Design a protein around this ligand. Structure first.
Ligand SMILES: NC(=O)C1=CN([C@@H]2O[C@H](COP(=O)(O)OP(=O)(O)OC[C@H]3O[C@@H](n4cnc5c(N)ncnc54)[C@H](OP(=O)(O)O)[C@@H]3O)[C@@H](O)[C@H]2O)C=CC1
Ligand SMILES: Nc1nc(=O)c2c([nH]1)NCC(CNc1ccc(C(=O)N[C@@H](CCC(=O)O)C(=O)O)cc1)=N2
Ligand SMILES: [Mn+2]
Ligand SMILES: [Mn+2]
Length: 159
């Protein structure tokens, strides 16, 4: 099964100038917890924004160019990415925008964080048909001393 995980600000913004302007440690804890010990698939731009391999996870990067780092696995197509994961229960697709768009039709599950933030961005989460998805978990949090915005963890499963 293929899953997508993402953090969306208002108007499905997910990034700006190859970075994420907000800082939500609670959300990054949620990301870690839901990805650890699973393969993660990402695009090249997202690899360059993270800046390092994510520990405890098989890092798989999509790029039409040859790899420039043997600490991670490089692939050249969507099908090859999926094959490189092997026989695992859950593949996590961690973006960015162009990668998300390609894996959304294959995905059975979405892990979305909705952040109450107004941010100008250049990258959006793909527009998905709400009828196709059933919310099976929701958890709202108010802002606190560590998290400057209110946010909502949501898990959706394809109907
Ligand atoms: N808020 C969130 O949840 C997340 C936000 N982001 C943000 O998204 C932005 C980056 O997203 P985006 O600009 O769309 O870039 P992507 O991360 O989606 O990566 C795009 C690159 O990945 C390669 N690629 C994608 N698909 C293929 C394919 N089928 N075959 C071969 N190569 C492929 C290409 O590399 P190449 O050009 O070398 O061929 C392409 O240029 C950043 O700002 C990041 O911070 C990222 C993840 C999560
Ligand atoms: N919900 C969600 N939030 C995000 O911030 C996110 C996402 N999903 N999907 C992809 C993505 C891409 N960018 C990044 C950037 C940094 C880390 C990172 O440093 N993660 C550490 C966090 C450790 C912690 O704070 O607990 C990790 O080990 O996963 C991960 C993904 N970011
Ligand atoms: Mn197999
Ligand atoms: Mn806010």
């Amino acid at each position: 099964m293929i899953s997508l995980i993402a953090a969306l600000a208002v108007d499905r913004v997910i990034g700006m100038e190859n970075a994420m302007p907000w800082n939500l440690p609670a959300d990054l804890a949620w990301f870690k917890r839901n990805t650890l010990n699973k393969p993660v698939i990402m695009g090249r731009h997202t690899w360059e924004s993270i800046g390092r391999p994510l520990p405890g996870r098989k890092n798989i990067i999509l790029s039409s160019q040859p790899g420039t780092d043997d600490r991670v696995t490089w692939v050249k197509s969507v099908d090859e990415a999926i094959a490189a994961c092997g026989d695992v229960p859950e593949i996590m697709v961690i973006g960015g925008g162009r990668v998300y768009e390609q894996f959304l039709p294959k995905a059975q599950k979405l892990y979305l964080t909705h952040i109450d933030a107004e941010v100008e961005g250049d990258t959006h989460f793909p527009d998905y048909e709400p009828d196709d998805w059933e919310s099976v978990f929701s958890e709202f949090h108010d802002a606190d001393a560590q998290n400057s915005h209110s946010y909502c963890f949501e898990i959706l499963e394809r109907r």
